[PDB]
Amino acid sequence: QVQLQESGPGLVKPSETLSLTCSVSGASISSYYWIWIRQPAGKGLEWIGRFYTSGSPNYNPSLRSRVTMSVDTSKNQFSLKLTSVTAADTAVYYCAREEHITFGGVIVRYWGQGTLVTVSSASTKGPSVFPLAPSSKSTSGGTAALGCLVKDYFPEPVTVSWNSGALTSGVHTFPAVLQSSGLYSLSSVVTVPSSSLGTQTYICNVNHKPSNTKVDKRVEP
Amino acid sequence: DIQMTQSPATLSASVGDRVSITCRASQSISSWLAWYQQKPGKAPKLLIYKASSLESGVPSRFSGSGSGSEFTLTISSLQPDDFAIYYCQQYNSYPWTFGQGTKVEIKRTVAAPSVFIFPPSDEQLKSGTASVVCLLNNFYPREAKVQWKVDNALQSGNSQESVTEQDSKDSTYSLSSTLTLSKADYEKHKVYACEVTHQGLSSPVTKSFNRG
Amino acid sequence: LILRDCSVAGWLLGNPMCDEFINVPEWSYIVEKANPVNDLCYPGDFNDYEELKHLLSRINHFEKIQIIPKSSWSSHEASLGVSSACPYQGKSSFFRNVVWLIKKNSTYPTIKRSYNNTNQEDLLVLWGIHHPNDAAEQTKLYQNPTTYISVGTSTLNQRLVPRIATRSKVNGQSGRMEFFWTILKPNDAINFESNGNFIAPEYAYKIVKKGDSTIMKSELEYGNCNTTCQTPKGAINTSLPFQNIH
Amino acid sequence: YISVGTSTLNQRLVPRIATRSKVNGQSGRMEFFWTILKPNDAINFESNG
Ligand SMILES: *[C@@H]1O[C@H](CO)[C@@H](O[C@H]2O[C@H](CO)[C@@H](O[C@@H]3O[C@H](CO)[C@@H](O)[C@H](O)[C@@H]3O)[C@H](O)[C@H]2NC(C)=O)[C@H](O)[C@H]1NC(C)=O
Ligand SMILES: *[C@@H]1O[C@H](CO)[C@@H](O[C@H]2O[C@H](CO)[C@@H](O[C@@H]3O[C@H](CO)[C@@H](O)[C@H](O)[C@@H]3O)[C@H](O)[C@H]2NC(C)=O)[C@H](O)[C@H]1NC(C)=O
Numbered sequence: 001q002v003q004l005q006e007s008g009p010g011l012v013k014p015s016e017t018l019s020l021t022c023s024v025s026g027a028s029i030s031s032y033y034w035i036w037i038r039q040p041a042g043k044g045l046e047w048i049g050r051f052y053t054s055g056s057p058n059y060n061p062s063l064r065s066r067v068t069m070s071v072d073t074s075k076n077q078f079s080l081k082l083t084s085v086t087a088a089d090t091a092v093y094y095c096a097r098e099e100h101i102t103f104g105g106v107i108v109r110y111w112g113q114g115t116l117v118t119v120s121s122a123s124t125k126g127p128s129v130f131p132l133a134p135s136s137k138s139t140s141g142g143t144a145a146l147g148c149l150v151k152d153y154f155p156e157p158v159t160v161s162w163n164s165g166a167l168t169s170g171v172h173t174f175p176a177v178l179q180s181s182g183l184y185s186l187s188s189v190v191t192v193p194s195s196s197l198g199t200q201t202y203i204c205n206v207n208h209k210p211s212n213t214k215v216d217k218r219v220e221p
Numbered sequence: 222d223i224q225m226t227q228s229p230a231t232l233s234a235s236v237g238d239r240v241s242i243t244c245r246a247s248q249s250i251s252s253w254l255a256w257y258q259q260k261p262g263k264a265p266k267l268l269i270y271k272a273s274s275l276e277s278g279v280p281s282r283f284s285g286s287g288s289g290s291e292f293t294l295t296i297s298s299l300q301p302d303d304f305a306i307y308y309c310q311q312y313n314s315y316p317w318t319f320g321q322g323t324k325v326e327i328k329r330t331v332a333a334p335s336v337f338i339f340p341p342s343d344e345q346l347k348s349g350t351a352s353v354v355c356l357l358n359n360f361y362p363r364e365a366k367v368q369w370k371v372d373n374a375l376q377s378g379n380s381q382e383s384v385t386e387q388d389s390k391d392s393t394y395s396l397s398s399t400l401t402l403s404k405a406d407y408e409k410h411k412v413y414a415c416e417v418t419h420q421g422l423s424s425p426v427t428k429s430f431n432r433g
Numbered sequence: 434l435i436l437r438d439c440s441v442a443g444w445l446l447g448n449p450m451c452d453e454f455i456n457v458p459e460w461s462y463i464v465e466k467a468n469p470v471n472d473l474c475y476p477g478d479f480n481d482y483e484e485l486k487h488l489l490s491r492i493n494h495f496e497k498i499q500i501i502p503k504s505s506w507s508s509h510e511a512s513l514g515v516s517s518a519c520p521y522q523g524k525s526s527f528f529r530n531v532v533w534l535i536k537k538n539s540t541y542p543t544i545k546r547s548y549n550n551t552n553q554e555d556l557l558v559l560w561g562i563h564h565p566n567d568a569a570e571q572t573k574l575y576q577n578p579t580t581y582i583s584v585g586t587s588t589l590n591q592r593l594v595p596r597i598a599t600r601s602k603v604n605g606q607s608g609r610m611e612f613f614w615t616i617l618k619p620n621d622a623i624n625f626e627s628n629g630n631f632i633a634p635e636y637a638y639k640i641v642k643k644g645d646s647t648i649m650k651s652e653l654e655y656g657n658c659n660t661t662c663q664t665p666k667g668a669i670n671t672s673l674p675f676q677n678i679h
Numbered sequence: 680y681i682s683v684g685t686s687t688l689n690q691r692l693v694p695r696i697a698t699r700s701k702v703n704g705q706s707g708r709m710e711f712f713w714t715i716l717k718p719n720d721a722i723n724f725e726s727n728g
Contacts, residue, residue, distance in 0.1 A: 043321075044308070044319050044320065044321045044322050045265070045308060045319040045322075046319070047316060047317040047318065047319070050315075058315050058316075060316040060317075061222075061316060062316075094264055104270050104271045104274055105253060105270075105271070105312055106312050107255070107267065107270050107312075108255075108267065109267055109276065111264035111265060111266075112264060113264060114264060128345070128348070130341075130342035130344055130345045130352075131342055132339035132342070132354060133339070133340070133342075135337075135338070135430070138337075140335075140337075143335070145337040145339075145356055145358065147339055147354065147356070149339075149342070149345075149352065149354070149399075151345075151350075151352070166605055172358070172385050172395045174383045174384075174385060174395070174397045175383050175384070175385070176383075177381045177383050177399070179381070179401070185381075185399070187354060187356075187383070187397045187399065189337075189356050189358070189395070189397070191335075191358055193525075195513060195515060196515070196517060196525065198511060198513060198514055198535050198574075199514040199515065199516055199517075199533060199535065199574070200516070200517050201570060201573060218569070220573060596684065596689050598684065598686060598721065598723075600686055601719075
């Protein structure tokens with residue numbers, strides 16, 4: 001049961017540096033190699049580098065000049081530092097565990113979740129959550145839809161969960177749309193039995209990590 | 222240093238078909254290739270190592286073959302949860318490299334959407350803007366057209382659509398068409414309507430609300 | 434009577450699970466198990482639960498009146514408040530005997546409905562109180578806050594007030610529901626007057642037979658023969674004067 | 680009025696205004712109540728006076 005999780009600012013002024021920290025639970029960072037990998041937009045994966053507390057590291061030659069990777073045995077922290085970030089360096093970043101040798105060689109079974117680093121001079125702006133009430137009047141057979149619109153947010157990473165993880169079936173959390181303002185807007189929708197509208201309530205937990213906003217809003221007819 | 226070229230970077234097959242994805246290499250990798258399944262918005266999940274060794278917990282239907290310069294990932298009975306981008310990797314020599322990935326999608330029975338309209342939120346209205354939303358839910362032919370009629374006045378501008386990726390269970394899609402207007406907020410107009418046009422519908426389905 | 438994995442409370446309150454016990458046979462020596470799987474689905478407790486159990490020791494058969502008002506009554510409330518808990522074979526449902534009363538058009542007018550069986554047998558009327566987690570929740574179900582529930586019978590009159598407070602999540606719901614019961618005599622009446630938070634009943638039980646029974650708890654399952662002796666451990670055959678079995 | 684609101688016990692109490700015998704120079708009395716609050720259990724006090 002090894003767990004990897006990344007922490008990242010979301011925004012890095014261009015021509016400056018990128019600092020990322022992958023915290024590891026369930027393994028001593030002293031006794032494993034660790035990997036940083038990059039994924040811009042929907043494009044392919046790019047392996048950034050490898051490091052080991054007691055072993056010389058190897059970094060991808062495209063990024064070598066800018067990459068430095070360190071380890072903090074006290075807090076089990078795997079670090080990534082990208083000097084002189086360009087616009088191209090805007091990407092999702094993943095940390096992973098380089099397993100010990102097997103008769104299958106070096107394998108990576110354990111991955112992080114990924115943090116999206118955008119590279120902009122723009123300013124962190126928090127979302128605005130507004131409900132999408134159900135038109136109970138609509139016959140719509142026996143089904144009815146609920147929503148939580150999330151508008152005017154500038155760091156793209158935005159997470160939406162319904163009823164604190166209790167609602168998972170029927171949820172369609174749409175992809176971001178970049179508006180003319182330069183700000184993003186998500187819609188999250190849930191199809192529901194029309195019957196359960198009266199007795200059960202419906203809530204949205206929306207957590208814009210870069211702005212540290214966590215607006216939870218109710219959807220009442 | 223060593224490139225990894227995959228094929229075809231776009232597939233589509235109904236459930237049960239065999240699928241096979243080829244991955245070629247600038248140099249010989251002997252058997253140091255690995256295959257990954259990246260689902261929508263998730264980390265890659267390692268499918269195959271040593272170019273043939275299935276990792277534990279991967280279904281019997283995945284199978285990797287090849288040595289040297291050409292390699293093949295094969296799915297025996299493509300299932301709905303297999304919708305994903307599939308990648309390929311050299312752990313032969315550094316720097317490590319990946320393929321461009323191939324997106325395996327799923328052909329399905331045609332599904333008619335279910336349409337919903339959402340009027341703008343009063344709180345937003347107080348802020349000084351307004352948004353109406355058409356929700357098209359669970360349709361297979363991703364291709365559909367949604368029109369915005371404002372008292373029978375089509376208005377292409379002030380509208381943005383976004384699409385879900387394929388569901389793992391249904392392999393269906395959903396659309397959100399967001400009409401964003403605030404000229405007199407949405408005053409000067411009594412009715413709003415979505416004209417939704419799709420193959421699963423004999424004649425276009427409009428839905429409409431006249432609140433404001 | 435076999436109760437498989439249903440509590441007595443569930444069998445009497447009509448829990449969607451084990452609704453296989455609605456056509457009660459005319460005979461009943463309680464075979465209940467300790468900690469049944471399907472009990473009071475929607476988190477709650479039964480007032481004077483063991484007293485009811487003791488009366489059941491005498492009772493041997495029941496008859497659902499199916500006359501207590503009805504779900505059709507929809508004058509002031511909505512008869513459509515099924516819960517995401519109490520799943521019927523995996524389908525969200527609620528106790529059939531009691532009813533999830535809920536405000537109608539953003540308005541929950543106090544209902545002074547009342548019933549007197551005038552039948553020849555006694556009654557086992559059942560009702561409940563919903564203790565919500567938020568006042569907002571209370572308003573969503575009953576726009577009236579700080580509600581009251583008045584039970585007016587010939588012998589017992591108790592006014593009850595719901596305790597609005599978030600508790601632990603059970604079956605996805607931290608709200609609780611108290612279940613009350615009373616024995617309505619033939620020609621005895623019961624008046625219900627509720628501000629809000631009322632779970633009125635729709636069925637009750639006519640005491641068909643009050644013979645001799647017990648609530649022996651036995652994790653054993655039925656096995657088909659028939660003696661003049663029964664114990665939660667088993668059934669005796671020879672007839673000596675004393676017993677060290679149970 | 681004095682309202683004690685816990686997860687298990689809710690009791691509303693009203694003071695009995697009445698002169699009694701003088702004890703320690705005071706005929707007023709004070710009732711003392713107690714409850715066991717579980718970890719993660721709450722107690723709401725609402726008092727008129
Ligand atoms: C329905 O509930 C009544 C509520 O108390 C309950 O009380 C009844 O008590 C007896 C039982 O029927 C009735 O006495 C009546 O006497 C007249 C003689 O003038 C007869 O003609 C009549 O048939 C009846 O026996 C009470 O009048 C009645 N109380 C009421 C209605 O105020 C009863 O169980 C039941 N009501 C009736 C009429 O059966
Ligand atoms: C202070 O008093 C609360 C009053 O009931 C009491 O209830 C709490 O119950 C648990 C215990 O912490 C909380 O559950 C939470 O679950 C979220 C997951 O989304 C966690 O992030 C969070 O840390 C917590 O474990 C309830 O939320 C909470 N009830 C409330 C506050 O309504 C608790 O004893 C205590 N509150 C907390 C937050 O500890």
